[PDB]
Amino acid sequence: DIQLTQSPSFLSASVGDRVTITCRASQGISSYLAWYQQKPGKAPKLLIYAASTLQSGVPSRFSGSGSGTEFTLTISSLQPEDFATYYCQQLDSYPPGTFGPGTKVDIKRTVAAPSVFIFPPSDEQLKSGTASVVCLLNNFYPREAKVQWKVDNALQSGNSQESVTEQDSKDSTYSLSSTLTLSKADYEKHKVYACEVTHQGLSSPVTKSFNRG
């Protein structure tokens, strides 16, 4: 089949910028391409078909160009309502076809380092036989952040999960939660629990830690 890639995967832009994102196809598909917009929790919206035809109802600041293997969607000036994910699609007779991975457009603001908080597991949870340690990275920009768990100054992998919020509507930052999950037995086998945070807002990694008890 045909594979589609999009660039960039992430774009940070301001209201009023001209924005150009790109779709490219593993092989010629020559005008069989559409562009859609999707916002979190809604169906996608068709923007452009036949690589260049604007879909009826779609504002004119949107335009598409290209053919063969390389295609481009442009927003000549960006509005608030435009921050969203954008997908390209190869049109096909039969239902497989292809969607690109998407390009997410978020709101540019100044760099802000995370505010970092750590939470030991509750006595109630420990009574259940499980320990969750929670690290919170609050109100940071840009969205890329690295979280490293360390137990007794030693590095963990595979025992944590991460969740990130959508960009905040008031201050345009992100927040991130990391949960380290251990058996009760493992948890009390060890003393120092630490969350080490790396983010372009920080001049060096910052570590928050507690001693069990």
Added chain:
Amino acid sequence: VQLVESGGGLIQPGGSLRLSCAASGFTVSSNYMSWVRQAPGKGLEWVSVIYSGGSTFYADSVKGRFTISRDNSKNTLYLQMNSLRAEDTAVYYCARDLGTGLFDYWGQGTLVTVSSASTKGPSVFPLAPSSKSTSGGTAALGCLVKDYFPEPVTVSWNSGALTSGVHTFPAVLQSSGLYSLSSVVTVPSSSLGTQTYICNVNHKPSNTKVDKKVEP
């Protein structure tokens, strides 16, 4: 034009489920009609199409298991699913297709969850304000909403009177097949010990309501 979907919900692997899409403002007999799904956090997939004169075609991931059909007299589209798999968990959309999979009109989506887990209310644990969650006049506190199924859960704080500084994070699916999420709020350190902070957790699928006071 309007497309209203129904029939999604929780179903066990190996089970069957039938979706409906009730169409207004145009006649499904005279169109290409399509189902398109979207797994949580992932991209779109066109899985089925029914042509004007009743020819049907399927993506190979659903071929042999899913069946697209319509009732002209009811003006409704249907997706019959059999032998469901965990990977079939997704929001399912019906769409008017202008041919070649060009989707100009979309339903609102219906969530289909394919899992072995039983419906289960969450345990709610405090994320207590401490010295390691206080810096300056700001303190972080929250609730860990652990091991529920299925989505969704709602969390408010102080029955909705407290909304500034709240972050309720998207749930993660754990290896267990159960969901966990945290909800945090940042508040004046001055307020601790005199202001009460309760997280109100509501898990409608298990009829579970929890009110957890969180304190230092």
